[PDB]
Design a protein around this ligand. Structure first.
Ligand SMILES: CC[C@H]1[C@@H](O)[C@@H]2[C@H](CC[C@]3(C)[C@@H]([C@H](C)CCC(=O)O)CC[C@@H]23)[C@@]2(C)CC[C@@H](O)C[C@@H]12
Lengths: 229, 12
């Protein structure tokens, strides 16, 4: 079991930072109490997502080196990863360890919330696939951090600067792959695979949106801005 | 423009 001190430090730091903010209890239990309605579900789901985004900007604001980047690039990294990051969380939430609590009920709200079962089917297929990988909090944390820290996002001016910040996360996740699952591996390769996949999911997501209707309810200001519309 | 995002990045 390798893992240098520099690497363990990054991991401990990232892990710390990863579990700080957390979703507000109000919005959370809002899926237990309160009930159905495609429009009510649509509002809850959209309320959380707006939350998630907020938590996400804080997490990446304290990712090693982030504030050191050009200000425009930071925006681009955020706008560029908000959706994909959301996918990773969705994955984390859905598969692995069922605390016999609200999460299985969240799936229900998602089903019939004005979302085409022609979209939820493949999407949930994906989450179940990433599930097969039997990932840990740490793997989810690093993936989220490397997803956010992608030098190949459409508008960044200085990609090397972002690279310097992402490689360390990449080196760690990989070494972490040998450790937890050496039986194969390929696992690290496959993990990076899912990272390319959800990039195409971002595309479908953008399309499913303009057809997402529910009565006439609108998304929150932030979402309209980050999800584009 | 991303005015909201910007605002969340500078003082939250
Ligand atoms: C077909 C799949 C659904 C789930 O992935 C939903 C997202 C909205 C955001 C969530 C509700 C995430 C939530 C904000 C995580 C909160 C947390 O941090 O605990 C996890 C489940 C997510 C839908 C409706 C809307 C966006 C679409 O691309 C995917 C939908």
């Amino acid at each position: 079991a390798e893992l240098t001190v520099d690497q363990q430090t990054l991991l401990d730091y990232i892990m710390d930072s990863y579990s700080k903010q957390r979703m507000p209890q109000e919005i959370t239990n809002k899926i237990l109490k309160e009930e159905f309605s495609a429009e009510e579900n649509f509002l809850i789901l959209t309320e959380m997502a707006t939350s998630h985004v907020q938590i996400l900007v804080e997490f990446t604001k304290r990712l090693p080196g982030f504030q050191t980047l050009d200000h425009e690039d930071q925006i681009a990294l955020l706008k560029g990863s908000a959706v994909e990051a959301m996918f990773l969380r969705s994955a984390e939430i859905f598969n692995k360890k069922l605390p016999a609590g609200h999460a299985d009920l969240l799936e229900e709200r998602i089903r019939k919330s004005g979302i085409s079962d022609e979209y939820i089917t493949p999407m949930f297929s994906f989450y179940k696939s990433v599930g097969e990988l039997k990932m840990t909090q740490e793997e989810y944390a690093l993936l989220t951090a490397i997803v956010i820290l992608s030098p190949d996002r459409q508008y960044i001016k200085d990609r090397e600067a972002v690279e310097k910040l992402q490689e360390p996360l990449l080196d760690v996740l990989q070494k972490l792959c040998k450790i937890y699952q050496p039986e194969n591996p390929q696992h690290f390769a496959c993990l990076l695979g899912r990272l390319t996949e959800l990039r195409t999911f971002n595309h479908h997501h953008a399309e499913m949106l303009m057809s997402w209707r529910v009565n006439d309810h609108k998304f929150t200001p932030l979402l309209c801005e980050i999800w584009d519309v | 423009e991303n005015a909201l995002l910007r605002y969340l990045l500078d003082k939250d």
